[PDB]
Amino acid sequence: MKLTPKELDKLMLHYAGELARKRKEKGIKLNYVEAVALISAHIMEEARAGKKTAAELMQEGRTLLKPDDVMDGVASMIHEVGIEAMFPDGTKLVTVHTPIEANGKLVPGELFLKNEDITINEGKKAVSVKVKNVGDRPVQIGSHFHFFEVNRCLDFDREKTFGKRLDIASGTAVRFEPGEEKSVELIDIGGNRRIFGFNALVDRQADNESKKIALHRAKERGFHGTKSDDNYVKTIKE
């Protein structure tokens, strides 16, 4: 047979699903493990039969278990069942999203939230800058990127954005479609304001003296919207 470790794991999973199906036949309401295993084993068998596509199986995994077939609390615990199955065209990942609908009141890990909003970046004044993507490719910018050093294809008044980042939720992003034009809010970067990396445009302390060096470097490297005055005077370290 030359079974691999994967084949042994999948055989164990198939028989866990078989036990789940037997218990469902006996009239027992399935718990979390049984529901997960039943969905996974059904998907594997369907993929072995070779008569359905992976997308069909993603849709079919959601009709196996009605809400009355599982215990209270089960539906809210199974966000997604992923299972890798071998189709005639090879191994594909099938994920079923929210296979079971909630019918009871039991929610394990239920979150009870205050209805008050969170104020982020408190004490930081936000300026508004209009930005246009003159390139032919999409550009996405995160919350803590130094906005002065974004893709050179974005065009905006770079001088007003030095030492600033997007005033959005941490870990979120703003997208710029090709040709898209929109305005964004920028707050000052906090901490020691020591900007290293990102395009190597600053790589030092952020201040008015280093803003001139950054503007000159940006203009030399073709960053759009950069207007650094001609007759630039170099310093001893650039």
Binding site: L3, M86, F145, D203
Partner: protein, 569 residues
């Protein structure tokens, strides 16, 4: 002088010169190019056969007497497809050729002498290839290592610390202490191992410290921030330390587009992961770098071969790993710019053309660690079905295509990561990391793994059975997998700097510790059978791929070989 019919000769000793053998259930046909044997002097082991005291085992052996000999093996290597005997001495490949006893047989050289200290392994009717090398491992779970071992992979290169979120995204082992953790954990496993450090920093001292702590190179991953500054610094340090750099570029084009990244690379050697871009990379045109001289372009197995289920599967997989929502138009826009069935289709043809040079896994990070070799041969079979036999063939065989695709997971990754003097091919002087294949199961399920010159894994029946064949048969750890024997059979690759500072003795490592070398002076021209450079253009709107002005595409497959015929699941 007697005449023997080809049929009975092949049944006794395997195919000989001019014979052809099908590889697995594919359409690829391998032709034996040359035979090192003397007809009538073949080595056979058994009752009443030749490998006995005074006939083929010498009673007065040379001093280079073999520990192990593989008789009548069909070698499939990038150096050729031919029949020979393989002699193993002290964990290295000692000789390739005739093999036997000089007292009773004519063409036996001192390095292929069979004496009383030699073990016999029959290889008649079997294929011997080098152990596979996987260079895109996310060290997420230790259970990946046995899975890759059972598929024919003997070296895993990558990074990670475990099921941490940083490792689930990146092949990075960050910092000296985490490197020490993973290097001491490595003592457990039957696999050659090497670890990549974090390249995503602009601090040169931090970069240098990781190399001196035992890493064999850097990974630059967009999840830690793939910026031109970090790329530039990491390449500078790598050039000073002679280690490889791997890159997962910025899909969001946040700091720049693909040409800005190439400008940051500045013509230095770089190994690009999942160059077609479904696994990440400048949307939509990262694939264009696969034509550059200084780029070593690799692909991950989930995108090859291109099938009818590929696009939907990758779409849903992306929606899950990045926690995207279908009701948000920005998440849809990101997903559409990322998947691109056009580039996925083009990737198969680029493998056939020799533009892509390495196949890898991206294991448990949108990739399947036990399927690199299988999907490589599925891609080769699909390409032969679509485009027919290659024009570089010499004869009614697919030998050139076989070498081209075999190089993608054996010799090219070894050259890319500076270990091609130890592993990567069946050559004299190299480490005896060998895989035995029966041709009916070639590319999907091997017979046994020889690790460091000793058997480490094999198909095996139940321990209580009267013979090793009866059921159930599955892959079981052999003796080189256990005790203190595994320390002699396995290598931990480190940087030259760490090796010179006694990383082995400092960390108390019992495995063999070897330095990587020759990582910075290689280009696309150093890849065997995959050295095609070309100008690649990608349409910003239609996402079509043009190589040297001509559109490149492949059509999806509704059924592949080596998939449902061989596996119960």
């Amino acid at each position: 002088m007697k005449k023997i019919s080809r049929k009975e000769y092949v049944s006794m000793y395997g195919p000989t010169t001019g014979d052809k053998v099908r590889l697995g259930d594919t359409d690829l046909i391998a032709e034996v190019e040359h035979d090192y044997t003397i007809y009538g002097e073949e080595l056979k082991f058994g009752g009443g056969k030749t490998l006995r005291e005074g006939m083929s085992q010498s009673n007065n052996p040379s001093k280079e007497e073999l520990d192990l000999i593989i008789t009548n093996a069909l070698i499939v290597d990038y150096t050729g497809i031919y029949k020979a005997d393989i002699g193993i001495k002290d964990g290295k490949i000692a000789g390739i050729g005739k093999g036997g006893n000089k007292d009773m047989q004519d063409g036996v050289k001192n390095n292929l002498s069979v004496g009383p200290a030699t073990e016999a392994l029959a290889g008649e009717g079997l294929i011997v290839t080098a152990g596979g090398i996987d260079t895109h491992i996310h060290f997420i779970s230790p259970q990946q290592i046995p899975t890759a071992f059972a598929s024919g992979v003997t070296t895993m290169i990558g990074g990670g610390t475990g099921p941490a979120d940083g490792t689930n995204a990146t092949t990075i082992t960050p910092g000296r202490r985490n490197l020490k953790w993973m290097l001491r954990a490595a003592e457990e496993y039957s696999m050659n191992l090497g670890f990549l450090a974090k390249g995503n920093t602009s601090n040169d001292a931090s970069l240098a410290d990781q190399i001196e702590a035992g890493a064999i190179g850097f990974k630059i991953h967009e999840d830690w921030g793939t910026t031109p500054s970090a790329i530039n610094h990491a390449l500078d340090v790598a050039d000073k330390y002679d280690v490889q750099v791997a890159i997962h570029t910025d899909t969001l084009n946040e700091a720049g587009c693909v040409e800005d990244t190439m400008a940051a690379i500045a013509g230095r050697t770089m190994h690009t992961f999942h160059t077609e871009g479904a696994g990440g990379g400048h949307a939509p045109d990262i694939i264009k770098v696969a034509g550059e001289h200084n780029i070593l372009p690799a692909s991950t197995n989930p995108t090859i071969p291109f099938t009818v289920n590929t696009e939907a599967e990758h779409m849903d997989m992306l929606m899950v790993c990045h926690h995207l929502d279908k009701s948000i138009k920005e998440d849809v826009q990101f997903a559409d710019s990322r998947i691109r069935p056009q580039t996925i289709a083009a990737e198969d043809t680029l493998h056939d053309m020799g533009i892509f040079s390495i196949t890898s896994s991206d294991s448990q990070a949108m990739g399947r660690v036990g399927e690199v070799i299988t999907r490589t041969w599925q891609t080769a079979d699909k390409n032969k079905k679509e485009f027919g036999r290659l024009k570089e063939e010499k004869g009614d065989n697919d030998n050139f295509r076989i070498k081209r695709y075999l190089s993608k997971y054996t010799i090219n990754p070894a050259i890319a990561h500076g270990i091609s003097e130890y592993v990567g091919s069946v050559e004299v002087g190299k480490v005896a990391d060998l895989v035995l294949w029966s041709p009916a199961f070639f590319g999907v399920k091997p017979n046994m793994i020889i690790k460091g010159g000793f058997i480490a894994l094999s198909q095996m029946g139940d321990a209580n059975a009267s013979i090793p064949t009866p059921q159930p048969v599955y892959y079981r750890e052999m003796f080189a997998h256990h005790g203190k024997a595994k320390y002699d059979a396995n290598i931990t690759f480190v940087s030259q700097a760490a090796y010179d500072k006694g990383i082995k003795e400092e960390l108390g490592l019992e495995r063999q510790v070897l330095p990587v070398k020759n990582c910075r002076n290689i280009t696309k021209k150093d890849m065997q059978f995959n050295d095609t450079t070309a100008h690649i253009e990608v349409n910003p709107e239609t996402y079509h791929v043009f190589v040297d002005g001509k559109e490149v595409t492949s059509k999806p497959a509704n059924k592949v070989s080596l998939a449902q015929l061989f596996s119960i699941f």
